[PDB]
């Protein structure tokens, strides 16, 4: 359950802190996590929930090289790894999804700092072949509301954006539109 | 094979586990009703240290109750004055046994068994005396606190709070060697080389534990750590090296690193 | 004359008070609320002249905490016994928010102004320093609320006070307009600090340069405005939501259940109709936001004005300085 | 080198002496108090001060040091940074009567700090004259008057430096606080205008016949540095980046008025 949650909710919350925050919904793991995330004493992990928290912090920093022990070593330590003959399939799926999202949890934050990208460095950083990486970036820019442009045949990507201070513009835009579209309910009560 | 454990526990539950529960219950019956200084005489401290050693030798599960019971014994006597029971304020053989001699082994047992929250509760167990037992002098050979606590405060706090603990150790042990009599040359350069070099290592305990929800009054979480080092706010950047290099530190430090 | 409503005249604060205010640093920490001193003064030419202040301390270990009035009583004798007075016509604070007259400052002011009416409250623009206008703010409490003073009501009984419709955008007096007459020894400092050496002027002027280039000034002000103001906006909206649902949306359902009841019956008294029709506890015009919150809409507008203005001056200076 | 040599005074000491000397404190032209602050081994760091029950006459002195215990107890609670340092007085530096004030201060243990504020009309007086004793051995008749004079270096802690300058501007011309950054603006280009006057005089000293020794390469370094600050270097990429920054700042300053408008509109519907 928690790895099926992690391998969606972290690139999803990285998009929310790229101000795509209107997709937030209650009962998701963020409220459950808070009772541990509020505590200062967060030393090295020694429980399956703490191994998910350490994998979550590494993934919330965009890192799949540290996560190799959370995928393998800690599943062996918890005696969870051995329980399926399909664990060899799960290992491959985990690695491929973790490569896709350790890219995206970097992209959603680094979008203020980008300008253009070498697709060769993506295949060296995230292991995936260029035929596969061509689909992966296309599936993002078609759907996830980012401002990039893609050059698959010249092994290249583009963004050219401005204003890294946009979080104030966007937070006040939300503060004001949840004014004008909330304000009208008082008139509908009055009539 | 989906839920079945390997056979070692399966034989030891058949023949051993009733006996480890009997030892736990045997230590737990006498050091509550009878043996502790809720009265005025027969010293329990030879026995009180052994239950933590038992958690490491057999099974760690008993430490959580141990600690809360050793804390309950501490809470029953500090200011309660329930009877003529021996005061913490002058009787040094008893008082320093209640401050140090169980709690050194509590901290060592907690960090050896990876119990980081219980280890921090065991630095709060002494700090809850350092705020209350204020009229006696400092406990004997004070350096035995600061040189040990550095390794738990590294993993539970940070490398920066560890290096600031080496500053507190330095400014104390600069004078305390007048009672801790020594002529060893090897400790002089070693004390300073660790205390200046380990400072720059990490400012970025980054706000990813905060940003996904509301702001709160969370300044507490910096203040609590800093309070154990004696500050209202945590340690502050390259000035921590400048406060050392103000003195002969750049000449006490080892010749291979002097110019760094 | 130049009086407001009631006997209380305009205030003036002598520079000797402003220096005794400024001797206290900003550095308590990030920020916590403390009343930093009482203001002492007397009715003179055009104004209440604040001649002097003594700083009123509090405990500041992490939170703030109070202490015995042995301080204030002994210190107000300490001011009296040199030459004879004790004259508390206001109090001041220098807390992190900017200038902001919070609900607690209104309650503390309500107790102060009802006891002594010749009084004002002071706030100063901190080392926060957005600095466009108005480094010192005066504010009196309206007489119209003081006539109905003991405490406010956790119940609809406030509605009889709300129908007076007393001010919550009320007038603030202009503190400084003419010379305070004790300008004269600090006038004689200026020649000694200026005409003979560079050593003592430039260290007061050097602050402006680094108020521009250094880290995120207007950006952090607009960031805190992106945090303070949206929290107040959301609060009024969900406060207004629930009360307007008691005002209309519940009466909407109860009117239909009255129509299902046929509005009363022959055989028995209208008990189930009367058990449907009970007044909901939040009235029209819930008083705390409509007054004290709206004193802070005015402060929020004035923080937005203050942050804007320094920005306007740069937008003129930047293009035109480079235009050469 | 033996000890104290310089005082690092600042505005609130002088403001508290003047607020004790004007108003009144029993004495007319002669008024006294106990200065507070701290020292750093050759400098004095005076932080704030307060007057005390006093009466000096040509045969009398009254220092109720018990009040300077009360005031010290009180001011310790105000901030930990104060210490009982010495004393201050008005009007004249040397008298036999001033030897009594040193005895009253010798009832406390530390090194004394005698300050005289000499309020003459004349520019030939520095406003405050600072002194400390020497040859303070073992008791003769009372105490000595062979004082070591002290220099000044000013420049104590930050926020007070703007406070005195606002008052010094007010001493020259009384003005209303709503204009203060516009006043910094319109004295801004005035500096560039009086610069245009001086730069003319420094050119004109070479234009007439001979001169300009007061300028040359130091003024050259000042002006080259000035144009390397304000404005920056001169590509047109900078002009467009400067324009985009003003269009962003204007869009932010605009958004602050958009939020004033919505601070209004929600405040308005609840008032119906």
DSSP tag of C81: T
**B232–C61: do the CB atoms touch at under 8 Å?**
yes
Residue of chain A nearest B6, judged by CA positions? A79
Please indicate whether chains D and B are in contact, defined as at least 3 beta carbon pairs under 8 Å: no
Measured between beta carbons, the chain C residues lying within 8 angstroms of A182 are 237, 241
Size (chain B), residues? 260
Which distant-in-sequence residues (6+ apart) come within 8 Å of B5 by Cβ? Answer: none
| DSSP tag of B79 | S
How crowded is residue A28: how many other Cβ atoms within 10 Å of its Cβ? 14
Q: Do C181 and C15 contact (CB within 8 A), yes or no?
A: no
Cβ neighbours around C25 below 10 Å, total: 15
Chain C hits for D246, CB-CB cut-off 8 Å, are 315, 318-319
Between CA B219 and CA D197 the distance in angstroms is 55
DSSP-assigned states of every residue in D238-256: HHHHHHHHHHHHHHHHHHH
| Other beta carbons less than 10 A from residue B62's beta carbon | 19
Assign D3 to helix, strand or coil.
Answer: coil
The position carrying tokens 């103001």 is: C229
Classify residue D212 as exposed, middle or buried by CB count within 10 Å of its CB (0-12, 13-18, 19+). Answer: middle
C238 touches chain B (CB under 8 A): no
| Orientation of helix C70-80 relative to helix D65-78, angle to 10° | 130
* Chosen from A164, A175, A176, A180 to mutate, greatest number of chain C CBs within 10 A: A175
Q: Which residue has the tokens 């604060």?
A: C13
Neighboring chain A residues of B211 at a CB cutoff of 8 Å: 17
Q: Where are the beta strands (DSSP E) in A57-189?
A: 116-118, 149-151, 156-158
Q: Do residues B94 and B86 touch, judged by C-beta distance below 8 A?
A: yes
Where on the phi/psi map is residue B87: left (φ > 0), alpha (ψ -120 to 50), or beta? beta
Contacts of C221 in chain A (CB under 8 A): none
Q: Is C29 on the interface with B (CB under 8 A)?
A: yes
CA distance readout (Å), D146 to C10, D88, D106, D130? 52, 18, 16, 13
Helix (H) or strand (E) segment spanning residue D6: strand D6-7
* Chain D nearest C-alpha distance from C208 (Å): 9
Q: How far apart are CA C199 and CA D9, in angstroms?
A: 13
Torsion over CA of B36, B39, B41 and B44, rounded to 10 degrees?
Answer: 0
Instruction: State how far Cα C322 lies from the chain centre.
Output: 40
Expressed in percent and rounded to 5, the helix, strand and coil fractions of chain B are 60, 0, 40
Question: Given its phi and psi angles, is residue C181 left (phi above 0), alpha (psi -120 to 50 degrees) or beta?
Answer: left
Tally of CB atoms within 10 A around C250: 12
CA torsion sign, B82 to B85 to B88 to B90? positive
Task: Give the 3-state secondary structure of residue D266.
Answer: helix
Mutate to test the interface with C, among D170, D183, D237 (most CBs of C within 10 A): D170
Gaps (C–N > 2.5 Å) in chain A: which residues precede them? none
Structure-token pair, residue B56: 């490491």
Number of Cβ atoms within 10 Å of the Cβ of C53 = 26
Which residue among A167, A175, A182 places its CB closest to the CB of C230?
A175
Does the CB of C27 have a partner CB in chain B at under 8 Å?
Answer: no
Of A63, A138, A71, A158, nearest to A103 by C-alpha is A63
Chains near B (3 or more Cβ pairs under 8 Å): A, C
- Most B CBs within 10 Å: which of C27, C28, C30, C62, as the mutation test of the B interface? C62
The DSSP bridge partners found for residue C39 are: C53
- Across the interface, whether the CB atoms of A178 and C226 are under 8 A apart is answered no
Alpha helices per DSSP H over chain D:
11-21, 65-78, 98-106, 160-172, 180-186, 188-208, 216-229, 236-269
Within 8 A of B233 by CB-CB distance, chain C residues are 29
Length of chain C equals: 324
H/E stretch holding B242 reads: helix B239-245
Does chain A touch chain B (at least 3 C-beta pairs within 8 Å)? yes
Q: Using CA atoms, how far apart are residues D76 and D64, in angstroms rounded to an integer?
A: 19
Binding-site residues on chain C for chain A (CB distance < 8 A): 219, 222-223, 226, 229-230, 233-234, 237, 240-241, 244-245, 247-249
Check whether the bond before D231 is cis (ω within 30° of 0): yes
Tokens 């009024």 appear where? C236
CB B83 within 8 A of CB B66: no
The bridge status of strand C88-93 relative to strand C120-124 is parallel
Instruction: Count the neighbouring beta carbons within 10 Å of the beta carbon of residue A169.
Output: 17
| DSSP letter assigned to residue B193 | H
Residues of C within 8 A of D29 (CB-CB) are none
Nearest C-alpha of chain C: how many angstroms from A186? 6
Q: Quick check: helix, strand or coil at residue B23? A: helix
PDB experimental method: cryo-EM
Cα separation of C136 and C131, whole Å?
A: 11
- For residue D148, which phi and psi values (nearest 5 degrees)? -80, 120
Tokens 């930990």 map to which residue? Answer: D80
B224 contacts in C (CB within 8 Å)? none
D47 phi/psi in degrees, rounded to 5: -110, -40
Residue A29 · residue A5 · CB < 8 Å: yes
Positive or negative: CA dihedral D18, D19, D23, D26: negative
Burial B154-190 (b: 16+ CB within 10 A, else e): bbbbbebbbbbbbbbbbeebeeeeeeeeeeeeeeebe
b/e map of B203-236 (b: 16 or more CB within 10 Å)? eeeeeebeebeeeeeeeebebbbbbbbeeeebbe
The CA distance from D229 to D244, in Å, is: 20
Q: Between C52, C78, C317, which is nearest D19 by CB?
A: C52
Instruction: Count contacts between B and C (CB, < 8 Å).
Output: 9
CA nearest to A59, candidates A112, A12, A98 = A98
Q: How far is CA A81 from CA A45, A70, B4, in A?
A: 18, 11, 14
Asked if D181's CB is within 8 angstroms of C132's CB, the reply is yes
Under a CB-based contact definition with an 8 Å cutoff, are residues B42 and B35 in contact?
Answer: yes
Instruction: Please give the order of strands across the beta sheet that includes A149-151.
Output: A116-118, A156-158, A149-151
The continuous run of DSSP H or E covering A87 comes out as: helix A87-110
What CA–CA distance (Å, rounded) separates D219 from D212? 10
Give pairs for C134-138: CB < 8 Å, separation 24+: C134/C99, C134/C302, C134/C306, C134/D177, C134/D178, C134/D180, C135/D166, C135/D177, C135/D180, C136/C13, C136/C18, C136/C175, C136/C176, C136/D177, C137/C99, C137/C172, C138/C11, C138/C172, C138/C173, C138/C174, C138/C175
Strands C120-124 and D87-90: unpaired
| CB < 8 Å & 24+ apart, contacts of D69-76 | D70/C74, D70/C78, D71/C78, D71/D34, D72/D34, D72/D36, D74/C71, D74/C74, D74/C75, D74/C78, D75/D36, D75/D48, D75/D50
User: What are the C-alpha distances in Å from D190 to residues A9, B94, C29, C258, D132?
Assistant: 59, 78, 39, 77, 44
C216: left (phi over 0), alpha (psi -120 to 50) or beta: left
Chain centroid offset of residue B9 CA: 33
Spatial neighbors of D61 by CB under 8 A, at least 6 apart, are D55, D97, D100, D101, D104
Please check whether residue B215 touches C, CB under 8 A.
Answer: yes
Q: A 169-188 residues with CB below 8 A of D?
A: 169, 172, 175-176, 179-180, 183, 186-187
Give the number of beta-carbon pairs within 8 Å between A and B.
33
Residues of B in contact with A37 (CB under 8 A): 209, 213
Of C222, C229, C244, the CB nearest to A186: C244
| Assigned token pair, B165 | 């603990």
Bridge partners (DSSP) listed for residue C135: none
Distance between CA atoms of residues C251 and C246, nearest Å: 7
Q: Which residues contact C158 (CB under 8 A, 6 or more apart)?
A: C152, C283, C285, C287
Q: Which residues on neighbouring strands pair with residue D147, listed in sequence order?
A: D133
Indicate the helix (H) or strand (E) that contains B194: helix B186-197
- Provide, as residue numbers in chain D, all residues whose Cβ is less than 8 Å from the Cβ of A187: 269
| Contact (Cβ atoms closer than 8 angstroms) between residue D4 and residue D104 | no
Chain C touching partners, 3 or more CB pairs below 8 A: A, B, D
Rounded Cα distance between B207 and B210, Å, is 5
Q: Which residues of D touch A (CB under 8 A)?
A: 244, 248, 251-252, 255, 258-259, 262, 265-266, 269-270
Q: Which of D266, D267, D268 to mutate to test the interface with A (most CBs of A within 10 A)?
A: D266
Q: Round to whole Å and give the CA distance between C127 and C25.
A: 9
Say which DSSP state B218 is in: T
Distance CA C41, CA C45 (A): 12
Q: Tell me, yes or no, whether chains A and D touch by having 3 or more C-beta pairs under 8 A.
A: yes
Alpha-carbon distance of B160 to B222, in angstroms, equals 13
Q: How many other β-carbons are positioned within 10 Å of the β-carbon of residue D118?
A: 15
Distance CA B70, CA B66 (A): 6
Can the peptide bond before residue D37 be classed as cis, meaning omega within 30 degrees of 0? no
Going by C-alpha positions, the residue among B114, B19, B126, B116 that lies closest to residue B70 is: B126
CB pair distance less than 8 Å for C74 and D70: yes
Cβ neighbours of B219 in C, within 8 Å: 29-30
* Whether A185 and C219 lie within 8 Å, measured CB to CB: no
Rg of the Cα trace of chain A? 20
Asked if the Cβ–Cβ distance from B155 to A44 is below 8 Å, we say yes
Taking the CA atoms of chain D, what radius of gyration do you get in angstroms? Answer: 28
The residues, ordered by sequence, that sit 6+ positions from C189 with a Cβ below 8 Å of its Cβ are D14, D127, D164, D168
Q: Tokens at residue C282, please? A: 């939040």
A167 Cβ neighbours under 8 A, 6+ residues apart: A19, C226
Which residues of chain A are within 8 Å of residue D269 when distances are taken between CB atoms?
183, 186-187
Task: Give the number of other CB atoms < 10 A from CB of residue C256.
Answer: 10
Residue C240 CB partners (closer than 8 Å, separation 6+): A186, D266, D269, D270
Q: Which positions ≥6 away from B103 have C-beta within 8 Å?
A: B122, B125, B126
CA distance linking residue A169 with residue C226, whole number of Å: 9
Asked if residues C38 and C56 have their Cβ atoms less than 8 Å apart, the reply is yes
Q: How far away is chain C from the Cα of B173, in angstroms, using its nearest Cα?
A: 28
Start-to-end C-alpha separation, chain D: 78
- Residue C122, both tokens: 């002071």
Contacts 24+ apart (CB under 8 A), B140-145: B140/B92, B140/B96, B141/B179, B141/B180, B142/B172, B142/B176, B143/B169, B143/B172, B143/B173, B143/B176, B143/B180, B144/B100, B144/B104
Distance CA D113, CA D36 (A): 10
Interface test with D, best of C126, C180, C186 (most D CBs within 10 A): C186
- The CA R_g of chain C, rounded to the nearest whole Å, is 26
Within 10 Å of residue A158's Cβ, how many Cβ atoms?
Answer: 14
Alpha helix (H) residue ranges in chain C: 15-22, 70-80, 103-115, 143-146, 159-162, 184-192, 202-205, 207-213, 217-244, 250-260, 271-276, 287-288, 294-323
Classify A68 as helix, strand or coil: helix
A180 touches chain C (CB under 8 A): no
> Measured between CB atoms, does D230 come within 8 Å of chain C?
yes
Task: Report the relative pairing of strands D147-149 and D128-133 from DSSP bridges.
Answer: antiparallel
The CB density around residue A79, as the number of other CB atoms within 10 Å, is 11
The nearest CA of chain A is from the CA of B155 a distance in Å of 6
Contact B116 A44 (CB under 8 A): yes
Q: By CA distance, what is C51's nearest residue in D? A: D19
Q: Residues with Cβ < 8 Å from D129, sequence gap 6 or more?
A: D93, D115, D116, D118, D149
DSSP state of C10: P
């Amino acid at each position: 359950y928690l790895v099926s949650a992690m391998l969606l909710e972290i690139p999803y919350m990285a998009a929310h802190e790229s101000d795509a925050r209107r997709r937030m919904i209650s009962k998701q793991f963020h409220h459950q996590l808070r009772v541990g995330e509020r505590q200062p004493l967060l030393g090295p992990p020694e429980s399956m929930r703490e191994h998910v928290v350490a994998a979550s912090k590494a993934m919330k920093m965009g890192d799949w090289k540290t996560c190799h022990s959370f995928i393998i070593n800690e599943k062996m330590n918890g005696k969870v790894w051995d329980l399926f003959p399909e664990a060899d399939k799960v290992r491959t799926m985990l690695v491929r999804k973790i490569q896709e999202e350790s890219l995206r949890t970097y992209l959603f934050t680094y979008s203020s700092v980008y300008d253009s990208i070498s697709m060769e460095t993506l295949s060296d950083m995230f292991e995936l072949d260029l035929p596969t990486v061509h689909s992966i970036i296309s599936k993002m820019i078609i759907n996830e509301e980012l401002m990039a442009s893609l050059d698959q045949p010249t092994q290249t990507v583009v963004m050219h954006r401005t204003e890294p201070t946009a979080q104030q513009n966007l937070a006040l835009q939300l503060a004001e539109k949840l004014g004008s579209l909330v304000e009208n309910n008082e008139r509908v009560f009055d009539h | 094979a989906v839920s079945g454990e390997d056979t070692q526990d399966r034989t030891d539950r058949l023949l051993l586990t009733p006996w480890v529960k009997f030892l736990w219950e045997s230590y737990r019956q006498c050091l509550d009703l009878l043996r502790n200084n809720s009265r005025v005489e027969r010293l329990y401290h030879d026995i009180a240290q052994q239950a933590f050693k038992f958690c490491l030798q057999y099974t760690r599960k008993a430490e959580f109750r141990k600690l809360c019971d050793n804390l309950r014994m501490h809470l029953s006597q500090i200011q309660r004055h329930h009877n003529q029971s021996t005061a913490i304020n002058l009787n040094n053989p008893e008082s320093q046994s209640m401050h140090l001699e169980t709690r050194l082994v509590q901290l060592d047992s907690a960090i050896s068994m990876e119990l980081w929250q219980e280890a921090f509760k065991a630095v709060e167990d002494i700090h809850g005396l350092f705020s209350l037992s204020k009229k006696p002098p400092k406990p004997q050979l004070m350096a035995n606190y600061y040189n040990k606590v550095s390794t738990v405060f590294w993993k539970s706090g940070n490398a920066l709070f560890h290096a600031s603990t080496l500053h507190r150790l330095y400014h104390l042990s600069r004078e305390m060697r007048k009672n801790l009599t020594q002529d060893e040359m090897q400790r002089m350069s070693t004390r300073v080389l660790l205390a200046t070099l380990s400072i720059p290592i990490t400012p970025e305990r980054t706000d990813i534990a905060r940003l996904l929800d509301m702001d709160g009054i969370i300044v507490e979480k910096q203040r609590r750590l800093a309070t154990l080092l004696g500050l209202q706010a945590p340690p502050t950047r390259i000035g921590l090296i400048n406060d050392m290099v103000r003195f002969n530190v750049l000449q006490y430090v080892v010749p291979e690193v002097k110019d760094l | 004359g130049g009086s407001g409503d009631s006997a209380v005249k305009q205030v003036q604060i002598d520079g000797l008070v402003v220096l005794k205010i400024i001797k206290h640093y900003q550095e308590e920490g990030q920020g916590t609320e403390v009343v930093q001193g009482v203001l002492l003064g007397l009715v003179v030419e055009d104004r209440l002249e604040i001649t002097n202040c003594f700083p009123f301390p509090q405990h500041t270990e992490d939170d703030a905490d109070f202490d015995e009035v042995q301080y204030q009583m002994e210190m107000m004798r300490s001011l009296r016994h040199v030459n004879i007075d004790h004259l508390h016509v206001g109090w001041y604070q220098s807390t992190y928010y900017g200038s902001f007259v919070t609900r607690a400052l209104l309650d503390s002011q309500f107790s102060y102004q009802h006891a002594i009416e010749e009084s004002v409250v002071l706030i100063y623009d901190p080392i926060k320093t957005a600095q466009g206008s108005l480094s010192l703010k005066a504010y009196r409490l309206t007489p119209k609320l003081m006539e109905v003073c003991k405490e406010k009501d956790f119940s609809p009984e406030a509605l009889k006070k709300a129908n007076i419709t007393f001010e919550h955008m009320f007038e603030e007096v202009p503190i400084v307009i003419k010379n305070s007459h004790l300008i004269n020894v600090l006038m004689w400092e200026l020649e000694k600090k200026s005409a003979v050496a560079d050593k003592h002027e430039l260290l007061s002027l050097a602050s402006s340069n680094h108020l521009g280039k250094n880290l995120q000034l207007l950006m952090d002000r607009v960031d805190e405005m992106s945090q303070d103001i949206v929290k107040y906006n959301t609060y009024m909206r969900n406060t207004s939501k629930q009360q307007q649902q008691k005002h209309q949306y519940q009466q909407r359902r109860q009117q239909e259940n009255m129509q299902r009841q046929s509005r009363g019956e022959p055989p028995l008294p209208e008990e189930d109709l009367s058990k449907l029709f009970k007044p909901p506890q939040p009235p029209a015009r819930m008083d705390s936001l409509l007054i004290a919150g709206q004193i802070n809409t005015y402060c929020q507008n004035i923080k937005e004005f203050t942050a804007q203005n320094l920005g306007k001056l740069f937008m003129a200076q930047a293009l035109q300085e480079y235009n050469n | 080198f033996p000890g104290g040599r310089v005082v690092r005074l600042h505005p609130v000491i002088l403001a508290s002496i003047v607020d004790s000397y004007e108003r009144r404190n029993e004495g007319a032209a002669r008024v006294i108090g106990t200065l507070l602050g701290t020292v750093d081994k050759h400098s004095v760091e005076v932080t704030n001060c307060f007057s005390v029950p006093h009466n000096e006459s040509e045969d009398e002195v009254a220092v109720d040091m018990e009040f300077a215990k009360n005031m010290y107890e009180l001011h310790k609670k105000v901030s930990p940074n104060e210490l009982i340092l010495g004393w201050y007085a008005t009007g004249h530096d040397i008298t036999e009567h001033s030897v009594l004030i040193h005895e009253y201060y010798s009832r406390e243990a530390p090194n004394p700090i005698h300050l005289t504020v000499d309020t003459s009309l004349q520019n030939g007086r520095m406003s405050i004259k600072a002194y400390v004793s020497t040859s303070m051995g073992v008791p003769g008749r009372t105490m000595g008057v062979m004082f070591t004079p002290l220099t000044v270096k000013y420049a104590y802690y930050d926020t007070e430096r703007i406070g005195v300058d606002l008052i010094m501007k007010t001493c020259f011309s009384p003005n209303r606080v709503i204009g203060l950054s516009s006043d910094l603006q319109q004295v801004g280009g005035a500096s560039a205008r009086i610069q245009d006057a001086l730069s003319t005089v420094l050119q004109y000293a070479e234009d007439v016949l001979s001169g300009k020794v007061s300028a040359d390469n130091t003024v050259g370094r000042f002006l080259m540095s000035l144009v390397n600050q304000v404005p920056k270097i001169v590509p047109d990429d900078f002009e467009t980046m400067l324009n985009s920054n003003i269009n962003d700042l204007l869009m932010v300053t605009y958004l602050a008025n958009l939020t004033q408008s919505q601070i209004a509109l929600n405040e308005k519907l609840v008032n119906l």
